[PDB]
Every structure is written in C-alpha cells, then in structure tokens.
C-alpha cells in the first residue's frame, strides 16, 4: 500500500570542500605568503562561573593554543577548494523503489537557486566564520573552469543578486542537475590589521595538556573541511518563522543554541519525504529543502 522508507537510506555528500589553510600576507603584496603557525601560551583567569560565588577568590591557570597574524602582515589569506558532484539521487545504501520514485518526484526542483545560494555562501565568505569579525574588507577570488572571478564586500545574510555569483551558479546547477563535477578554487583575503587574532578550527579532543586546541596541519593553522561544509550549505530560509539562513539539516537543527526549527511541525525532512514519495504535492521550497538534504548526504535510519 503506502510506499514506506527503507530501514536505512543513504546518500553521499555532493558539496565536498577541502581543509582551509591559513596564510598571512600584506594587502598590496599577495605573492609573498607565509603560513600562520599555531602556538601555545599560558592563560591565567578567574572563576567567573554563574553557579558558585564561594570560589571566585581562587584562580585558574590554563594553557591554550592561539594563532595570530605576524606583526608585519595585515591580511589573513584562507585557501581551499570545493568539488560539486552530480547524480544527487543515486542512493548509496537505500533501496530502489522508494529512492527512484523520490528521484522522479524531485526532478522539477529549483537547482538554480540551490546552486546560487551555495556559490553565494562561498563568495561572500560565510565559510570564514569568526574571521569576518572586524575586517576592513573581504576579497574573494574563485577560479573555476579556467575563469577567475573577484568579489568584494558582500552581504552574507541576504542572497542579493550578483551577475558573477549567477555565472558560477550556472555551471554548479548544471552539474548538480545532471552528472559530472566542477571544482572551484577559493581564496579569501581579509584586511584585519597587523598582529590580529585569526580563528582556526577548534579541536574536539580529550587532551588534558590543553584547554583549547586549534586544528593544525604540520603546525599551520587550518579549518576542518566539515566546518567549511556546514558554512556552505547554510541556505535554509524556508522554516517557519524564518529569520536568517540555517544549515540544511533534516530537523532544522541548530544544537549550537539549543533549538530545532523543524521539530514536530510537519516540516521535517522525513515528513516531507514521505509526502513526496506517497503522491503528495511539494512547494518549490520544500522540494529545495529535500533535495538540499540529499545534496548534504546522510545515513537516514529508522523504518521497517
């Protein structure tokens, strides 16, 4: 009767970013780059914890990683690549019937908009996260298919119209809508000032020697591929009471803040996917949300 979902339905991710390496340059001398190295320092502080005042007179010594621009370079340079891949509907472990009728129900999905918002998050430098705070200007250089595009200061929380973002979203939507691949080589330049703190990815480790460990590749500050990924796929402006774009998540999850904007309101990925497969009609943006979840990849479990 009802076409139910497999026990596990799995898709691979289709936006594949690399690690972001962090160099230091001068804004008007971008061909003399030097790597930003992770260092270690002592940090003494107080016990300023909301709970207990009875131990605020004691201190706490700590040691942490830190990363800074040198005192003779004013510009942070962040480098990475992003590979977009097609065949966004070939399941990796899910069955045949459910996945194929879903591929059929979603072939009319607005891929131009998804490609635009991906490329736009890349070009405006949302992937730079806290490295955006306090920048004089941000300049993004994207090299794709022997073409070089330059982007100056761009509004991140609005997907404002730009002819070059659209010109790259052309090829990106062409690959996503069909098959093949396309690789963008991305550079970011931020004018922060000589000696400014940069913000590499923070490590999630049980390490008693450090209170804060920054991600490093042979000592050089870097950012996790998965964090750049979480930045790029932040395109969801379609949940109820929508304010700012959030990352494509099956439950609209922002565990960061302790809320999920798609929990228990008929608008989660599984409700909408069961709808799409079982004959129901989908909004253009519900189609976009479900297909963006497929682009995200995942191992969606539960069912029979």
């Amino acid at each position: 009767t009802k076409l139910k979902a497999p026990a596990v339905l799995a898709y691979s991710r289709k936006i594949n970013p690399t690690n972001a390496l962090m160099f230091a340059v001068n804004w008007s001398d971008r061909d003399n780059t030097t790597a930003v190295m992770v260092g270690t320092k002592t940090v003494a502080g107080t016990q300023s914890v909301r709970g207990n005042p009875n131990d605020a007179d004691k201190g706490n010594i700590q040691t942490v990683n830190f990363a800074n621009l040198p005192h003779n370079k004013n510009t942070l340079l962040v480098k990475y690549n992003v590979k977009f891949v097609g065949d966004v509907f070939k399941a990796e472990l899910g069955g045949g019937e459910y996945s194929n009728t879903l591929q059929t129900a979603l072939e009319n999905t607005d891929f131009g908009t998804l490609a635009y918002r991906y490329v736009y998050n890349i070009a405006a430098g949302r992937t730079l996260w806290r490295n955006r705070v306090g920048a004089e200007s941000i300049e993004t250089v994207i090299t794709v298919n022997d073409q070089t595009f330059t982007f100056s200061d761009l509004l991140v929380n609005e997907f404002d119209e730009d002819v070059d973002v659209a010109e790259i979203a052309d090829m990106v939507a062409g690959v996503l809508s069909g098959e093949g691949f396309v690789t963008l080589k991305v550079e970011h330049y931020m004018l922060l000032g000589e000696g400014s703190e940069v913000f590499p990815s923070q490590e999630f480790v049980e390490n008693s020697k450090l209170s804060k460990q920054l991600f490093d590749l042979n000592g050089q500050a870097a950012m996790h591929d998965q964090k750049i990924g979480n930045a790029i796929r932040t395109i969801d402006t379609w949940y109820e009471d929508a304010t700012t774009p959030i990352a494509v998540e099956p439950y609209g999850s922002v565990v960061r803040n302790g809320v999920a904007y798609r929990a228990g309101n008929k608008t989660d990925l599984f409700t909408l996917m069961d709808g799409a497969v079982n004959g129901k009609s989908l909004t253009e943006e519900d189609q976009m949300f479900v297909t963006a979840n497929l682009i995200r990849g995942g191992v969606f479990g539960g069912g029979k």
Partner: protein, 248 residues
C-alpha cells in the same frame, strides 16, 4: 611487458582513520586494494597490484587521544530531541599526502590511460577522505629488475609499506619486534541470511572480523625488491605483497 602508472602527492583531507577497533591511523592495504579494484570497475583497466606510500600524515586530535567528530541528527523519530547535541560514536579522522603506483594491463598509448585514470580519481575518495589535489599521473615500464628500480625510485619521496609477517601475535610482535599492526584481511564469522538491508540483493554476505599482519615502513628507494611492496588481493580473503614477506 610490465606497465605502471604513478600519481604523486595525493593530498587527502578527512580520512576515516579507524581501520579496526584496535588500529587507528594509516589506512590499511585493504583500503588501497579496494581503491584499485574500484578503478578497475569504473574504467575497465585491469589493475594487477598497487603500492602506496605516505608523504605526510596526521590524525586529528592530540598525541594520545583522537579527535571527536560532531554527530548531526540523522534518524527518524528524533524531532523531540533535535534541540540538543546528538549522541556520539567515535570516528577518528585524519589528513594526509600519499603517493600511489598501480601496475596495470595496458597496450594502448599512455595519454589515454592517464586521462582515464585522472577522470576516475576526480570521482573517488581515499578511505573516505576528500581528494584535494594530485599531481599529473605518469606511466613507466620495466622489463628486467633494473627498470623496476627506476619505477620504484620514480615514487620518491615516500614511505611504502612492506609485509614482515607475524611471528607470535600482534601484541607480542608490536612489543618485541617494534613493528606496527595492520588489517590485512578478514575472517568470516557467519553468513548473513537476508539481504533486505545490504548493498546488494544478491551478493553473498558475511559477518566478519579483521585479520592482521605486521608491517613496516621503508623509503621506496631503500626497498630492494619492489615486488615486496606491491599489494594485491588473494588467498583466503586476505591481501599480500607480490614479493612475499620482507627480508630482501
């Protein structure tokens, strides 16, 4: 005669560094043999053996503890809980730079082989890790054991993996022989009955548990017999080197 194709400096970011429950780090030979077989399936080129070497490698985390990856919510019936950090299994990731060498059956011209190889690599991963950049693959050939040394040193520089077998067992050999365990194959524990939940509806399925050997890392140069460093599938659902156990 004997043709090889080499791809140097394969920068890979995001490797699934857990090869088994007791080995975390360099992806094992089973992984690179599976990569070679995937290429065989996807291009049609017959892949005799593969030899891989680490140029750079780092497991994420500290010296004695691997990094955690932040699990994102993924399963049905969890909406009443997606407002909190998802529970979390261990999944150590790593980042590295490798050099690969595939022995292939090729009769055509080198340009066609190189282009097919590149077009495959552009669609692949390595042990789950995203491939960020690789050099242009190039072909070499060997008749006698003299040109084999040139093919060998063409991979320079990198540390390739040789199989030095198991004397007592994994743990005693690690302590006494100062070597490193490595997943070399699998042991079948029980046949799986129903392919309702498998990658295939038809392929034979088994619950398995890894089988290991004791390996060593050596500069492709200092290796004398290059066959001792070329890994391929084979007997008893393991993998091994063309030149057997390493002692020249």
């Amino acid at each position: 005669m004997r043709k090889f194709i080499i791809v140097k400096n394969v920068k890979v970011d995001g490797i699934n560094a857990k090869s088994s429950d007791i080995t975390v780090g360099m992806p094992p030979a089973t992984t690179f043999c599976g990569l070679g077989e995937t290429m065989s399936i996807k291009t049609g080129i017959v892949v005799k053996a593969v030899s891989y070497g680490s140029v750079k490698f780092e497991v994420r985390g500290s010296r004695f503890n691997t990094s955690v990856t932040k699990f994102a919510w993924q399963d049905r019936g969890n909406g009443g809980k997606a407002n909190n950090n998802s529970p979390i299994q261990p999944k150590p990731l790593a980042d590295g730079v490798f050099t690969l060498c595939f022995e292939v059956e090729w009769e055509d011209c080198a340009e066609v082989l190189v282009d097919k190889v590149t077009n495959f690599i552009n669609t692949a991963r390595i042990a789950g890790g995203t491939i960020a950049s690789f050099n242009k693959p190039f072909v070499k050939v060997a008749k006698d054991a003299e040109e084999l040394a040139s093919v060998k040193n063409a991979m320079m520089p990198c540390y390739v993996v040789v199989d030095c077998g198991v004397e007592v067992n994994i743990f005693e050999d690690a302590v006494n022989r100062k070597l490193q365990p490595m997943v070399n194959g699998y042991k079948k524990l029980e046949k799986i009955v129903d392919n309702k939940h498998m990658r295939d509806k038809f392929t034979p399925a088994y619950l398995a548990t890894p089988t290991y050997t004791m390996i060593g890392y050596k500069m492709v140069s200092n290796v004398d017999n290059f066959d001792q460093a070329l890994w391929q599938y084979g007997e008893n659902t393991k993998v091994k080197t063309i030149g057997g156990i390493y002692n020249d």
